[PDB]
Amino acid sequence: SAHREPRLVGGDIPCSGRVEVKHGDTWGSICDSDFSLEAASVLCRELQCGTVVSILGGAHFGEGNGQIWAEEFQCEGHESHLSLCPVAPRPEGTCSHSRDVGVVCSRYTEIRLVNGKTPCEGRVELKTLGAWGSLCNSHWDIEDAHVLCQQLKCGVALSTPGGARFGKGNGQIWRHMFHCTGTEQHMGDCPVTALGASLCPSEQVASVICSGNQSQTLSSQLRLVNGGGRCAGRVEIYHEGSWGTICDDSWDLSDAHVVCRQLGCGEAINATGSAHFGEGTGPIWLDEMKCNGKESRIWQCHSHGWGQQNCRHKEDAGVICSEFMSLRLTSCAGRLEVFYNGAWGTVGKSSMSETTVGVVCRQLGCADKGKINPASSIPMWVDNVQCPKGPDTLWQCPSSPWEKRLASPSEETWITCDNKIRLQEGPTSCSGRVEIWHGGSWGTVCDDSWDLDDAQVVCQQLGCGPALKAFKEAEFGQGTGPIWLNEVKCKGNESSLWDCPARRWGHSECGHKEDAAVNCTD
Amino acid sequence: SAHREPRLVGGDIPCSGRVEVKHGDTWGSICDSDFSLEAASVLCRELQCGTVVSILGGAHFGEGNGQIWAEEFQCEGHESHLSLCPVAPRPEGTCSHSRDVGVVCSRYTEIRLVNGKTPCEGRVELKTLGAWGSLCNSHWDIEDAHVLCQQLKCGVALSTPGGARFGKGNGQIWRHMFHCTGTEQHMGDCPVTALGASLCPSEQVASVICSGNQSQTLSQLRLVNGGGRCAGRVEIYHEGSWGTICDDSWDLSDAHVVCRQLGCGEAINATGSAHFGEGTGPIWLDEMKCNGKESRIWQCHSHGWGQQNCRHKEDAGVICSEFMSLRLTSACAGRLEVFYNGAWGTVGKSSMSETTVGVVCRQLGCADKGKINPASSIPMWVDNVQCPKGPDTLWQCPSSPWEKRLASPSEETWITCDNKIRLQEGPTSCSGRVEIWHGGSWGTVCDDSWDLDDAQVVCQQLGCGPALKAFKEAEFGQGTGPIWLNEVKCKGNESSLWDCPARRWGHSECGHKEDAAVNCTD
Amino acid sequence: SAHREPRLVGGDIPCSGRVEVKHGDTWGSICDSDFSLEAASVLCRELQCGTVVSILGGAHFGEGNGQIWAEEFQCEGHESHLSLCPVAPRCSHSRDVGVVCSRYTEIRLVNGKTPCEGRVELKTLGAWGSLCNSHWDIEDAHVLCQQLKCGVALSTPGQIWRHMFHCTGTEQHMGDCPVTALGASLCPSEQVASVICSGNQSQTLSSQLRLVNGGGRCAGRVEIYHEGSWGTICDDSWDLSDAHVVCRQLGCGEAINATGSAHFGEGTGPIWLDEMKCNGKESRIWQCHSHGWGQQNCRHKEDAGVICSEFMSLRLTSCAGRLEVFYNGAWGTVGKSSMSETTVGVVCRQLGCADKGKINPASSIPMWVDNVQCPKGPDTLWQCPSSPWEKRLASPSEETWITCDNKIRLQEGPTSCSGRVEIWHGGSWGTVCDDSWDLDDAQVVCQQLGCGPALKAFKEAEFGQGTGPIWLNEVKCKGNESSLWDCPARRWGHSECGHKEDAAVNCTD
Ligand SMILES: *[C@@H]1O[C@H](CO)[C@@H](O)[C@H](O)[C@H]1NC(C)=O
Ligand SMILES: *[C@@H]1O[C@H](CO)[C@@H](O)[C@H](O)[C@H]1NC(C)=O
Ligand SMILES: *[C@@H]1O[C@H](CO)[C@@H](O)[C@H](O)[C@H]1NC(C)=O
Ligand SMILES: *[C@@H]1O[C@H](CO)[C@@H](O)[C@H](O)[C@H]1NC(C)=O
Ligand SMILES: *[C@@H]1O[C@H](CO)[C@@H](O)[C@H](O)[C@H]1NC(C)=O
Ligand SMILES: *[C@@H]1O[C@H](CO)[C@@H](O)[C@H](O)[C@H]1NC(C)=O
Ligand SMILES: [Ca+2]
Ligand SMILES: [Ca+2]
Ligand SMILES: [Ca+2]
Ligand SMILES: [Ca+2]
Ligand SMILES: [Ca+2]
Ligand SMILES: [Ca+2]
Ligand SMILES: [Ca+2]
Ligand SMILES: [Ca+2]
Ligand SMILES: [Ca+2]
Ligand SMILES: [Ca+2]
Ligand SMILES: [Ca+2]
Ligand SMILES: [Ca+2]
Ligand SMILES: [Ca+2]
Ligand SMILES: [Ca+2]
Ligand SMILES: [Ca+2]
Ligand SMILES: [Ca+2]
Ligand SMILES: [Ca+2]
């Protein structure tokens, strides 16, 4: 089990850091060319860190002091430990410490229990932005308490005592709204939403009293599907052990209100129909929902009965709730716009750190970093957004509460995301190995079917001049992270490498020794 | 079997009338908005009435007294009885008795045996036009007698005695020419031709004597895809399959025998090279050297029972003298022209009732009714055409014998068929639910992708000006019959709804709750 | 055994001749239609003549006086004798059958104090000659001693035949050994091949690298053997030194290409070696500096193959065009001088398109080989003795242009592209049975013949009875096959069709 024991060091959040693997007894770094997405997934799984968010090569969390291992992990991605992974050691030189690999996993939450008589109950205390703080009890349900107790290994939660029972706590209140269903064993797996979360009374601090028996386990259904979020999508209901849809007959805002308040998504904005979020694959359970908009559950409405319908899947009902938040850039480059409460709105530029811009760019899936620009008219929704390290979406980023207020264009935020594609380890900026950003991490392109047309499309994507050479076999050096593309069958005139046909987004049989490079004109 | 026992009432012909289905023990009608073509087909099949001809909603056969059932028959179409179909009842009332559904089935013949000691023997009598007439043996073969006996549940026939053995006949003599093959169960399944049939001797009347034993049971050749009974690809049946001729050395002499076998007289054209389509099925007849005098296709110098050596693209077809075709010349408004004996000619206007014009319009497939117009150079074949109820083709209609003669311009038949498209349940004639006529019954257009281009096409096809609003989800009520069109992708400039791309003429997953509608300028 | 005792007579080379199966006491020929590929294979095996090369019909080796047998041999193929095969008793002497087996070598020992010892002599082109020891290794001596029933070899001390025998030592006969005599260099008169065999028949030999999917002997993906499984070599740092090592190890001269990226197809086996650091001087590939057995970070998409100096390929460039031979990594022409009809037939058959061809005048590329003299029996040009390889410039007058008759043909037809369909396979002109012979089959046949689309697909022997055997029946052509050989059907025998069921085609004029 300690054959290749991984660990994360150099990170300021629990499940991110420079990857160090212990070969028996010596802790040593890993070059980013020897650590694929599958190996990072195995590393995050073994450390109980959840799913891999990003592979950060080039010593993102600082260079390690010691020795660099020369083994390329050929993990299949389903392994439980890094010891079970097959590796391909190389006798020759390995790498430089300026290219150590770092991995960001998804369990960054760092929530604990403080000021309790028995070690595992008390005031819930959360750490974001480098400072501990009390969580608000407005959205601290018993399911969140159950997940927290399971994470701290004390079984289930007895109660969430409201008020300052365990103490108000010396610090500020964190407004994060954990949306745990109770079925997950870590608060980092829960969908948390801290953007614009409403202010909290000082004395309304969340707490929890766990059962304390580890052997004690939780014992026992509506969901929204294909909505591009959490509070929108096709209304899917569960009955007779099957996920079924609701026909959009007489499906109005009252029905949407009921399903949105049942899911904890606030009121509703749209009661969509005609399969707005895609046709479902399952029996239609309800046909004519006659909810008054006041009851707390959808099944307790005046429907036609389970399975009693005259509808098809082409008209499955779906909803868009008030708590449905969306993000976009309009002119990636343009004005940052957040879609909350059914209305698009700009984001305040105040306290917009580099981390927040990077989070926005990663969320939009077009860069790892970005920069704020002056304006090149809609009101401002949120302001003072402060993204910590670890969230790949803006909605987990604490900020001032939502306020529908008018904003001058000067103090809104315009950001230009960095290039999707970069050239690394080259003498100039127009030559080197092709790197592309997708899926949270920088990756490479393999040299299979890497002719000069692919070099042409890469050069015209970076803005460089015409392509000169399309190198193969990692001429400029082995790359970082996963191999996103191989067999790119470009015609040489595409607007970007993404439109070019290829075996896309991982699963390429190529290694990092076959990294594709280009030589553009200065 | 009595759970849903259908019956047809209010019809002058045997196999048509208002649809009444016994829901256990109470007789009640069915609304026309919850009776598709599959349910009508099951109804016709169960009642031993052949295939369904047309679904006539709106109390075509009369107002049904009693109760209306709100059960939407979800019949697949192949059920033996209506009791075996899925049922999707709705709690609310469906419609009034003014929208009772009616169904016309194929077996309208009403043929019987009269003036016999035993019920399985006597003079053949037939009922068309409300008159019990005595069929005569001009074309009454032994296959017709066998089918008549089998229909009457009397096993097989013995002989067809000539003269007035069972009586001359108390009334007038029908000239119908049944072309039974001896295998179909009912005389209504036989292809009958009574148009222009030759005058028949008064003392020669068809009579049949059967075996009288229900246990008795009987122990081929056909023309396919020719637009009639006496044209199309020649098909020979043996070894349980139907096969076509290779066309090689397929002369008019080889066509004379195949035409005289079916009773279609002499042969006009001996076609080939898939002239009537690509005939799927093994080819087992090649190098036909028929001399013409013989009366069987298999009696020729056949190369062998399976010496295919050919392709379905070289399939043999024939055109016979008794092949009949109909058209309107001036789309489907103009002079009535009938194609007999290889020439086109007019049709006499004398005794041309509304039923005959409706039959012509249905057969040409462009309306359910029509109207006689004044004249607005070819001879006249047939005159005094009298269509009864039940036939959808003009060739099953008794008429004066084919008399090639010159006729004045003031006595032929000019008809203008009704519009293929209509708007129902609207305040004005240019607003309401769009209904189209196809396949014998008035269906509706579903609302899937029913935009204003569709409404523009419909409004310009009706006859009035531009559209105002293309309605959705049965704004003016659920329509009658099937749903012919859905997902109509009109460009907005098509002259008629039939030019727009669509999922046309059935197999549409829509329901009558999704009936498209329009609003046109008055 | 003597129930059906076969023999080959009327052949110049040892293991070829007209088939004459003996019915106990009387020898009698066989009609060409009553003898299939499996029967010929069993015949070749029984007479210790190795595998069958071709079945020659129409009295290729003359007509044998006697009684022709009407029996039909339903040999499965693996029978050790013609007696053991099932027989189906029920022709003319002009249709007698002959077979050419693969052990045509006729190599012997002369001038020795013992019958199992002496100088090696070989007989090709009808003249006994002294094979010499330019490439006479100890494996060839072992194979010769085993063939002569002399045990194993001990040491190797008319005109001179320059044949190169590439025996591995495990071959029971010289005909089984791969032999290359095309363009072999001259050889000193005093330097000839000899062998002293042990003379102990009870004595036996005792105990790998290979190239596969190369279309020859000295090219293809490098397969190395380890731990009981044949594995590949990754092409990482697989430069020309590694190819030199694996080519000189296999006796294939120097190397022209060290191919990678699975040029000769992706192997199916564990990649054994990854980073070959051969200096080009060691005699074995495993003696190179590598990452070690099994240590590799490669896939099968990058298997390492080579193309060696002795790799030879044959092509015709316009199956008609100038004859070209690919030796030493460079394509080149073949000399027209002394181009006998046998050599043209061998060339046409090796191109896989005929059994005969006509020498034609030309309608630049330097010349490799000249004075090529193919004997009877080889089916490849590489085994035909000739003048040595020489890189020289030639005018198109002395170049070789050959127009071979393609395997598909139509015969007894009013036009060129009408008649019964006949194919060529195994040295005999067969006919296709009209089982499921539809217009798709005729389309394929007409497209292969090079004329317009088919008009009719006749049956029932429309254009007369075909000669020879029947190779094809129940051909399921889809109408778009380039050649009739790509159509999925039971091919080259195992057909009960008679000549009355010969298929025919009618194409456009
Ligand atoms: C939601 O409703 C608003 C207000 O009626 C409308 O503007 C918007 O287009 C709707 N969006 C969807 C997806 O239905
Ligand atoms: C890229 O092209 C430039 C322009 O010819 C050349 O000077 C440079 O050496 C090239 N780089 C490589 C790595 O070949
Ligand atoms: C049929 O034959 C007649 C002549 O008898 C000719 O006028 C007509 O065009 C023919 N029609 C076809 C379809 O061959
Ligand atoms: C059609 O449109 C006009 C004008 O918009 C409206 O007055 C009329 O009521 C509409 N027709 C129907 C049936 O509603
Ligand atoms: C072999 O090497 C020569 C030398 O450049 C080259 O021209 C040829 O294309 C190569 N062939 C293969 C199959 O690699
Ligand atoms: C080939 O077909 C054409 C037309 O189908 C015919 O005229 C010709 O005689 C045929 N050739 C034969 C049968 O050899
Ligand atoms: Ca919560
Ligand atoms: Ca609906
Ligand atoms: Ca509702
Ligand atoms: Ca409904
Ligand atoms: Ca590669
Ligand atoms: Ca490419
Ligand atoms: Ca009849
Ligand atoms: Ca034929
Ligand atoms: Ca023909
Ligand atoms: Ca004929
Ligand atoms: Ca719809
Ligand atoms: Ca449309
Ligand atoms: Ca040798
Ligand atoms: Ca490689
Ligand atoms: Ca090397
Ligand atoms: Ca390697
Ligand atoms: Ca075929």
mmCIF file with all atom_site columns, N, CA, C and O in Angstrom, chain A residues 247-249 274 287-288 304 308-312 314-315, chain B residues 72 74 88-89 91-92 446 448 473 509-511 513-514:
data_model
loop_
_atom_site.group_PDB
_atom_site.id
_atom_site.type_symbol
_atom_site.label_atom_id
_atom_site.label_alt_id
_atom_site.label_comp_id
_atom_site.label_asym_id
_atom_site.label_entity_id
_atom_site.label_seq_id
_atom_site.pdbx_PDB_ins_code
_atom_site.Cartn_x
_atom_site.Cartn_y
_atom_site.Cartn_z
_atom_site.occupancy
_atom_site.B_iso_or_equiv
_atom_site.pdbx_formal_charge
_atom_site.auth_seq_id
_atom_site.auth_comp_id
_atom_site.auth_asym_id
_atom_site.auth_atom_id
_atom_site.pdbx_PDB_model_num
ATOM 1   N N  . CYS A 1 247 ? -45.294 15.152 -17.800 1.00 0.00 ? 247 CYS A N  1
ATOM 2   C CA . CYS A 1 247 ? -45.780 15.776 -19.019 1.00 0.00 ? 247 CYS A CA 1
ATOM 3   C C  . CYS A 1 247 ? -46.129 17.237 -18.762 1.00 0.00 ? 247 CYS A C  1
ATOM 4   O O  . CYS A 1 247 ? -46.623 17.602 -17.694 1.00 0.00 ? 247 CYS A O  1
ATOM 5   N N  . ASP A 1 248 ? -45.873 18.075 -19.763 1.00 0.00 ? 248 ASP A N  1
ATOM 6   C CA . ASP A 1 248 ? -46.048 19.514 -19.623 1.00 0.00 ? 248 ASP A CA 1
ATOM 7   C C  . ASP A 1 248 ? -47.482 19.969 -19.846 1.00 0.00 ? 248 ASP A C  1
ATOM 8   O O  . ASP A 1 248 ? -47.702 21.154 -20.113 1.00 0.00 ? 248 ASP A O  1
ATOM 9   N N  . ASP A 1 249 ? -48.456 19.068 -19.751 1.00 0.00 ? 249 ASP A N  1
ATOM 10  C CA . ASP A 1 249 ? -49.850 19.461 -19.886 1.00 0.00 ? 249 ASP A CA 1
ATOM 11  C C  . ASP A 1 249 ? -50.299 20.213 -18.641 1.00 0.00 ? 249 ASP A C  1
ATOM 12  O O  . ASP A 1 249 ? -50.181 19.705 -17.522 1.00 0.00 ? 249 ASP A O  1
ATOM 13  N N  . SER A 1 274 ? -42.417 21.047 -23.726 1.00 0.00 ? 274 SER A N  1
ATOM 14  C CA . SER A 1 274 ? -42.002 20.578 -25.047 1.00 0.00 ? 274 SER A CA 1
ATOM 15  C C  . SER A 1 274 ? -40.543 20.130 -25.044 1.00 0.00 ? 274 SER A C  1
ATOM 16  O O  . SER A 1 274 ? -39.812 20.331 -26.015 1.00 0.00 ? 274 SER A O  1
ATOM 17  N N  . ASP A 1 287 ? -49.385 13.814 -15.501 1.00 0.00 ? 287 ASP A N  1
ATOM 18  C CA . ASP A 1 287 ? -49.813 14.475 -16.726 1.00 0.00 ? 287 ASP A CA 1
ATOM 19  C C  . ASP A 1 287 ? -50.331 15.885 -16.481 1.00 0.00 ? 287 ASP A C  1
ATOM 20  O O  . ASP A 1 287 ? -49.788 16.846 -17.030 1.00 0.00 ? 287 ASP A O  1
ATOM 21  N N  . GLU A 1 288 ? -51.365 16.041 -15.661 1.00 0.00 ? 288 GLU A N  1
ATOM 22  C CA . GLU A 1 288 ? -52.030 17.327 -15.471 1.00 0.00 ? 288 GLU A CA 1
ATOM 23  C C  . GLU A 1 288 ? -51.796 17.779 -14.036 1.00 0.00 ? 288 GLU A C  1
ATOM 24  O O  . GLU A 1 288 ? -52.597 17.493 -13.143 1.00 0.00 ? 288 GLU A O  1
ATOM 25  N N  . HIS A 1 304 ? -53.120 13.323 -12.390 1.00 0.00 ? 304 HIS A N  1
ATOM 26  C CA . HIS A 1 304 ? -53.983 12.273 -12.910 1.00 0.00 ? 304 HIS A CA 1
ATOM 27  C C  . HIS A 1 304 ? -53.651 10.901 -12.343 1.00 0.00 ? 304 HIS A C  1
ATOM 28  O O  . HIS A 1 304 ? -54.352 9.933  -12.648 1.00 0.00 ? 304 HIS A O  1
ATOM 29  N N  . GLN A 1 308 ? -50.674 7.601  -15.309 1.00 0.00 ? 308 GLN A N  1
ATOM 30  C CA . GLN A 1 308 ? -51.902 7.946  -16.021 1.00 0.00 ? 308 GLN A CA 1
ATOM 31  C C  . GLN A 1 308 ? -51.630 9.202  -16.837 1.00 0.00 ? 308 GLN A C  1
ATOM 32  O O  . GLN A 1 308 ? -51.615 10.314 -16.303 1.00 0.00 ? 308 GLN A O  1
ATOM 33  N N  . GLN A 1 309 ? -51.411 9.027  -18.137 1.00 0.00 ? 309 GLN A N  1
ATOM 34  C CA . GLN A 1 309 ? -51.044 10.143 -18.995 1.00 0.00 ? 309 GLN A CA 1
ATOM 35  C C  . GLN A 1 309 ? -51.414 9.815  -20.433 1.00 0.00 ? 309 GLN A C  1
ATOM 36  O O  . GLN A 1 309 ? -51.685 8.663  -20.779 1.00 0.00 ? 309 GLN A O  1
ATOM 37  N N  . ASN A 1 310 ? -51.423 10.856 -21.265 1.00 0.00 ? 310 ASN A N  1
ATOM 38  C CA . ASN A 1 310 ? -51.609 10.723 -22.704 1.00 0.00 ? 310 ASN A CA 1
ATOM 39  C C  . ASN A 1 310 ? -50.530 11.494 -23.453 1.00 0.00 ? 310 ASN A C  1
ATOM 40  O O  . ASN A 1 310 ? -50.790 12.072 -24.510 1.00 0.00 ? 310 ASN A O  1
ATOM 41  N N  . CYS A 1 311 ? -49.313 11.503 -22.917 1.00 0.00 ? 311 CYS A N  1
ATOM 42  C CA . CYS A 1 311 ? -48.242 12.352 -23.407 1.00 0.00 ? 311 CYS A CA 1
ATOM 43  C C  . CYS A 1 311 ? -47.081 11.517 -23.924 1.00 0.00 ? 311 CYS A C  1
ATOM 44  O O  . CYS A 1 311 ? -46.981 10.316 -23.664 1.00 0.00 ? 311 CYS A O  1
ATOM 45  N N  . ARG A 1 312 ? -46.203 12.179 -24.667 1.00 0.00 ? 312 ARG A N  1
ATOM 46  C CA . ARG A 1 312 ? -44.967 11.605 -25.171 1.00 0.00 ? 312 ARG A CA 1
ATOM 47  C C  . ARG A 1 312 ? -43.788 12.218 -24.426 1.00 0.00 ? 312 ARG A C  1
ATOM 48  O O  . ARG A 1 312 ? -43.949 13.076 -23.554 1.00 0.00 ? 312 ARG A O  1
ATOM 49  N N  . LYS A 1 314 ? -41.621 13.987 -25.931 1.00 0.00 ? 314 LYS A N  1
ATOM 50  C CA . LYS A 1 314 ? -41.289 15.213 -26.692 1.00 0.00 ? 314 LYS A CA 1
ATOM 51  C C  . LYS A 1 314 ? -41.820 16.422 -25.960 1.00 0.00 ? 314 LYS A C  1
ATOM 52  O O  . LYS A 1 314 ? -41.545 17.532 -26.402 1.00 0.00 ? 314 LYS A O  1
ATOM 53  N N  . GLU A 1 315 ? -42.597 16.203 -24.923 1.00 0.00 ? 315 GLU A N  1
ATOM 54  C CA . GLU A 1 315 ? -43.224 17.273 -24.158 1.00 0.00 ? 315 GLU A CA 1
ATOM 55  C C  . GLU A 1 315 ? -43.054 17.035 -22.663 1.00 0.00 ? 315 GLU A C  1
ATOM 56  O O  . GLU A 1 315 ? -43.981 17.186 -21.866 1.00 0.00 ? 315 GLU A O  1
ATOM 57  N N  . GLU B 2 72  ? -59.702 6.981  -24.936 1.00 0.00 ? 72  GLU B N  1
ATOM 58  C CA . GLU B 2 72  ? -58.894 7.145  -26.139 1.00 0.00 ? 72  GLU B CA 1
ATOM 59  C C  . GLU B 2 72  ? -58.262 5.800  -26.475 1.00 0.00 ? 72  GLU B C  1
ATOM 60  O O  . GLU B 2 72  ? -57.333 5.355  -25.793 1.00 0.00 ? 72  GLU B O  1
ATOM 61  N N  . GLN B 2 74  ? -55.897 3.406  -27.689 1.00 0.00 ? 74  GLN B N  1
ATOM 62  C CA . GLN B 2 74  ? -54.503 3.342  -28.129 1.00 0.00 ? 74  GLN B CA 1
ATOM 63  C C  . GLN B 2 74  ? -54.211 2.024  -28.839 1.00 0.00 ? 74  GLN B C  1
ATOM 64  O O  . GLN B 2 74  ? -53.258 1.316  -28.513 1.00 0.00 ? 74  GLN B O  1
ATOM 65  N N  . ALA B 2 88  ? -56.778 4.579  -22.551 1.00 0.00 ? 88  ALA B N  1
ATOM 66  C CA . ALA B 2 88  ? -56.300 5.722  -21.774 1.00 0.00 ? 88  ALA B CA 1
ATOM 67  C C  . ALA B 2 88  ? -57.461 6.678  -21.544 1.00 0.00 ? 88  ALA B C  1
ATOM 68  O O  . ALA B 2 88  ? -57.542 7.741  -22.174 1.00 0.00 ? 88  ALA B O  1
ATOM 69  N N  . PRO B 2 89  ? -58.379 6.334  -20.644 1.00 0.00 ? 89  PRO B N  1
ATOM 70  C CA . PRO B 2 89  ? -59.552 7.186  -20.421 1.00 0.00 ? 89  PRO B CA 1
ATOM 71  C C  . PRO B 2 89  ? -59.173 8.513  -19.786 1.00 0.00 ? 89  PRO B C  1
ATOM 72  O O  . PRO B 2 89  ? -58.176 8.637  -19.072 1.00 0.00 ? 89  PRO B O  1
ATOM 73  N N  . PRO B 2 91  ? -60.781 11.620 -17.283 1.00 0.00 ? 91  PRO B N  1
ATOM 74  C CA . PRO B 2 91  ? -61.893 11.852 -16.347 1.00 0.00 ? 91  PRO B CA 1
ATOM 75  C C  . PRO B 2 91  ? -62.946 12.814 -16.868 1.00 0.00 ? 91  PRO B C  1
ATOM 76  O O  . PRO B 2 91  ? -64.138 12.617 -16.601 1.00 0.00 ? 91  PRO B O  1
ATOM 77  N N  . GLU B 2 92  ? -62.547 13.847 -17.604 1.00 0.00 ? 92  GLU B N  1
ATOM 78  C CA . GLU B 2 92  ? -63.488 14.852 -18.072 1.00 0.00 ? 92  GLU B CA 1
ATOM 79  C C  . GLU B 2 92  ? -64.247 14.360 -19.298 1.00 0.00 ? 92  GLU B C  1
ATOM 80  O O  . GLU B 2 92  ? -63.817 13.438 -19.997 1.00 0.00 ? 92  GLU B O  1
ATOM 81  N N  . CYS B 2 446 ? -50.554 18.111 -36.825 1.00 0.00 ? 446 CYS B N  1
ATOM 82  C CA . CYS B 2 446 ? -50.061 18.293 -35.471 1.00 0.00 ? 446 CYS B CA 1
ATOM 83  C C  . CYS B 2 446 ? -49.254 19.584 -35.369 1.00 0.00 ? 446 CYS B C  1
ATOM 84  O O  . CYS B 2 446 ? -48.779 20.133 -36.365 1.00 0.00 ? 446 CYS B O  1
ATOM 85  N N  . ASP B 2 448 ? -46.369 20.250 -33.841 1.00 0.00 ? 448 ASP B N  1
ATOM 86  C CA . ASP B 2 448 ? -44.922 20.211 -33.682 1.00 0.00 ? 448 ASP B CA 1
ATOM 87  C C  . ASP B 2 448 ? -44.254 21.079 -34.740 1.00 0.00 ? 448 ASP B C  1
ATOM 88  O O  . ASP B 2 448 ? -44.387 20.823 -35.939 1.00 0.00 ? 448 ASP B O  1
ATOM 89  N N  . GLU B 2 473 ? -51.458 23.360 -29.761 1.00 0.00 ? 473 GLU B N  1
ATOM 90  C CA . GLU B 2 473 ? -52.053 22.531 -28.711 1.00 0.00 ? 473 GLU B CA 1
ATOM 91  C C  . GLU B 2 473 ? -53.581 22.591 -28.724 1.00 0.00 ? 473 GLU B C  1
ATOM 92  O O  . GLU B 2 473 ? -54.223 22.773 -27.688 1.00 0.00 ? 473 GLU B O  1
ATOM 93  N N  . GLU B 2 509 ? -46.133 10.696 -33.969 1.00 0.00 ? 509 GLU B N  1
ATOM 94  C CA . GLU B 2 509 ? -46.270 10.448 -32.542 1.00 0.00 ? 509 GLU B CA 1
ATOM 95  C C  . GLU B 2 509 ? -47.085 11.516 -31.829 1.00 0.00 ? 509 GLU B C  1
ATOM 96  O O  . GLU B 2 509 ? -47.050 11.582 -30.597 1.00 0.00 ? 509 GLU B O  1
ATOM 97  N N  . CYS B 2 510 ? -47.815 12.347 -32.564 1.00 0.00 ? 510 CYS B N  1
ATOM 98  C CA . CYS B 2 510 ? -48.632 13.379 -31.956 1.00 0.00 ? 510 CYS B CA 1
ATOM 99  C C  . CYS B 2 510 ? -49.976 12.811 -31.506 1.00 0.00 ? 510 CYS B C  1
ATOM 100 O O  . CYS B 2 510 ? -50.384 11.714 -31.892 1.00 0.00 ? 510 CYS B O  1
ATOM 101 N N  . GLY B 2 511 ? -50.665 13.583 -30.663 1.00 0.00 ? 511 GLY B N  1
ATOM 102 C CA . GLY B 2 511 ? -52.015 13.275 -30.258 1.00 0.00 ? 511 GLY B CA 1
ATOM 103 C C  . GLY B 2 511 ? -52.957 14.377 -30.715 1.00 0.00 ? 511 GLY B C  1
ATOM 104 O O  . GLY B 2 511 ? -52.532 15.449 -31.156 1.00 0.00 ? 511 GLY B O  1
ATOM 105 N N  . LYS B 2 513 ? -54.654 16.250 -28.970 1.00 0.00 ? 513 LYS B N  1
ATOM 106 C CA . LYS B 2 513 ? -54.499 17.439 -28.144 1.00 0.00 ? 513 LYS B CA 1
ATOM 107 C C  . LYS B 2 513 ? -53.509 18.429 -28.734 1.00 0.00 ? 513 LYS B C  1
ATOM 108 O O  . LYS B 2 513 ? -53.456 19.574 -28.274 1.00 0.00 ? 513 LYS B O  1
ATOM 109 N N  . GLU B 2 514 ? -52.726 18.019 -29.730 1.00 0.00 ? 514 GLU B N  1
ATOM 110 C CA . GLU B 2 514 ? -51.712 18.858 -30.351 1.00 0.00 ? 514 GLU B CA 1
ATOM 111 C C  . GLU B 2 514 ? -52.123 19.308 -31.748 1.00 0.00 ? 514 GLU B C  1
ATOM 112 O O  . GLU B 2 514 ? -51.273 19.503 -32.618 1.00 0.00 ? 514 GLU B O  1
#
